[model samples]
Target: VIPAAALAGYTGSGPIQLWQFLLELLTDKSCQSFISWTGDGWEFKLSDPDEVARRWGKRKNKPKMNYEKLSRGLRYYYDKNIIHKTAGKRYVYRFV
Candidate 1:
């Protein structure tokens, strides 16, 4: 089971944004399979998109999570200037 403390802030008050969740996964070595750096500085890809979505869903208690839902969440970050998609690159994202 995922530790409650590990997901404290995320489960409290409001849902965690996709960017925040992705950033957390990126920094966690154990989550490399879900998401990891592309060695291009602040750029990374969802190495396992389905797995990532699954994990995110589990964390958020959204069992129906999928790439489409997750990507839609990420797209919301565009206006916030937190992340941007690299054109022509699937699953790749850059932190701004």
Candidate 2:
């Protein structure tokens, strides 16, 4: 189940985190086309990261948020402990 605490963490006062943006796309079949959960509950993968990045670009007004830059934000989540790369991962990440 998605945590209200985690979803509610946003203040709506500044730029949102990639982890949150990603989570928003998650927690639903709404974005199942290019991203979806693995068998493991919290584990998810980017079936098509390119489209996901494009979607995020549209959401964030970037219009150029490619996987390259989007990945930087994903890596930053490693530091924030909201999302982490799975061991020997494959476009996979899990909540911590």
Candidate 3:
């Protein structure tokens, strides 16, 4: 799973990274069947940073991961152009 802490906002190069992810998703024709166009289900996944971090940590055998470190990685991604934060929202990040 892609880390939100790696892309939490539209700072500096964040938008570019976010766009890149978006482009990849949109262009992946084989994965189009997995795309969802409606509902708040996806919102929950995007808005909950702690949840995201926890899930990530779980995957890496670090169930006790904290939000601070999670948020840090999100910021790093923001800088790396891999993801971007949604405007006017807390912990709401999107794949471009």
Q: How many steric overlaps are in each model, in order?
A: 0, 0, 10
Please give, for residues 31-84, the per-residue lDDT of candidate 2 as tens digits.
Answer: 465456665656676677666677667767875776866667667655645777
lDDT value, residue 67 of candidate 2: 80
Q: What local distance difference test score does each model get?
A: 0.63, 0.63, 0.47
Candidate 3: list runs displaced more than 4 Å: 1-51
Candidate 2 wrongly placed segments (more than 4 Å): 1-17
- Spell out the clash pairs found in candidate 2: none
Q: Candidate 1: where is the Cα deviation over 4 Å?
A: 1-18
Pull out the clashing pairs in model 3. 5-73, 5-74, 6-73, 6-74, 6-77, 7-74, 9-85, 17-81, 17-82, 18-96
**Which candidate model has the greater TM-score, 2 or 3?**
2
Question: lDDT order of candidates, best first?
Answer: 2, 1, 3
Q: Name the lDDT of candidate 1.
A: 0.63
- Please give each candidate's TM-score: 0.65, 0.63, 0.42
